[PDB]
């Protein structure tokens, strides 16, 4: 949101606050799904490989949201926190 | 999208047979709403549910593989084409 009444300074701070696409990963997933048989050990290896991209993506998402939280005023943080409850 | 594939009645029954949470949000919330970003704590949060994620993914991928294999040649081409166009 869009719920927080962001000052123009804050939105510039935010714009400034905001690796490779997990594409070869999807390819390996495709090959597991399209196979004549299910290969559990190969699937486990794909899951484990996906954990490294997920870690990167989660760390980036949490760090971004943390830096945004800390440009907010007390009133805005309260609204941010309420909104966080309301998703999903 | 498996339903977009003109499933036969037999396939609908086969899929039926084949097919036979906030505690983690709260930890993310604690990491986000802090006056500093604690990367060590975040990495531990991210890793906590690794084994449940694995069990869930494995079940999904196996279910997907099972459904893919009841498709006809035509249906598989449609599914694979849609897969290429997505994500
Ligand atoms: N709220 C503190 C807890 C202490 C710690 O984890 O070091 C932090 O996120 O850093
Ligand atoms: Cl793909
Ligand atoms: Cl929460
Ligand atoms: Zn305001
Ligand atoms: Zn307002
Ligand atoms: Zn600037
Ligand atoms: Zn592939
Ligand atoms: Zn593909
Ligand atoms: Zn391939
Ligand atoms: Zn292939
Ligand atoms: Zn294959
Ligand atoms: Zn194997
Ligand atoms: Zn295993
Ligand atoms: Zn195992
Ligand atoms: Zn990796
Ligand atoms: Zn970085
Ligand atoms: Zn950084
Ligand atoms: Zn408020
Ligand atoms: Zn107010
Ligand atoms: Zn308000
Ligand atoms: Zn808690
Ligand atoms: Zn810690
Ligand atoms: Zn810490
Ligand atoms: Zn394990
Ligand atoms: Zn165990
Ligand atoms: Zn099984
Ligand atoms: Zn069949
Ligand atoms: Zn064809």
Curated annotation (Swiss-Prot), chain A:
The keyword Signal applies. Induction: Induced by many sorts of periplasmic stress. Produced upon spheroplast formation, not induced by growth in 0.5 M sucrose or 0.35 M NaCl, nor by mutants that have a leaky periplasmic space (at protein level). Induction is partially dependent on the Cpx envelope stress response encoded by cpxA-cpxR; does not depend on sigma factor E (rpoE). Induction is also partially dependent on the Bae envelope stress response encoded by baeS-baeR; cpx and baeS effects are independent. Its main location: periplasm. GO terms for molecular function: protein folding chaperone; protein homodimerization activity; unfolded protein binding. Homodimer. Belongs to the CpxP/Spy family. Has an elongated cradle shape. This is Periplasmic chaperone Spy. It comes from Escherichia coli (strain K12). The gene is spy.
Curated annotation (Swiss-Prot), chain B:
Induction: Induced by many sorts of periplasmic stress. Produced upon spheroplast formation, not induced by growth in 0.5 M sucrose or 0.35 M NaCl, nor by mutants that have a leaky periplasmic space (at protein level). Induction is partially dependent on the Cpx envelope stress response encoded by cpxA-cpxR; does not depend on sigma factor E (rpoE). Induction is also partially dependent on the Bae envelope stress response encoded by baeS-baeR; cpx and baeS effects are independent. GO terms for molecular function: protein folding chaperone; protein homodimerization activity; unfolded protein binding. GO terms for biological process: chaperone-mediated protein folding. The keyword Signal applies. The keyword Signal applies. GO terms for cellular component: outer membrane-bounded periplasmic space. Disruption phenotype: No observed growth phenotype. Increased levels of degP and rpoH transcription; may induce the sigma factor E regulon (rpoE). Loss of about 50% of periplasmic alkaline phosphatase activity; very sensitive to tannic acid. Keywords: Chaperone, Periplasm, Signal, Stress response. It is found in: Periplasm. Homodimer. An ATP-independent periplasmic chaperone, decreases protein aggregation and helps protein refolding. Binds substrate over a large region of its convex inner surface. Substrate protein folds while it is bound to chaperone. Increasing Spy flexibility increases its substrate affinity and overall chaperone activity (shown for 3 different substrates). Protects proteins in vitro against tannin inactivation; tannins have antimicrobial activity. Overexpression enhances the stability of otherwise unstable periplasmic proteins. Belongs to the CpxP/Spy family. Has an elongated cradle shape. This is Periplasmic chaperone Spy. It comes from Escherichia coli (strain K12). The lineage of its organism: Bacteria, Pseudomonadati, Pseudomonadota, Gammaproteobacteria, Enterobacterales. The chain holds residues 52 to 146 of 161 of the full protein.
């Amino acid at each position: 949101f869009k719920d927080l009444n962001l000052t123009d300074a804050q939105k510039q701070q935010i714009r400034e606050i905001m690796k490779r696409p997990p594409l070869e990963e999807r390819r390996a997933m495709h090959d597991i799904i399209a196979s004549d048989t299910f290969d559990k050990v190969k699937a486990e290896a794909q899951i484990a490989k996906m954990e490294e991209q997920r870690k990167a993506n989660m760390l980036a998402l949490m760090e971004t949201q943390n830096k945004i939280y800390n440009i907010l005023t007390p009133e805005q943080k309260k609204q941010f926190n309420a909104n966080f409850e309301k998703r999903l």
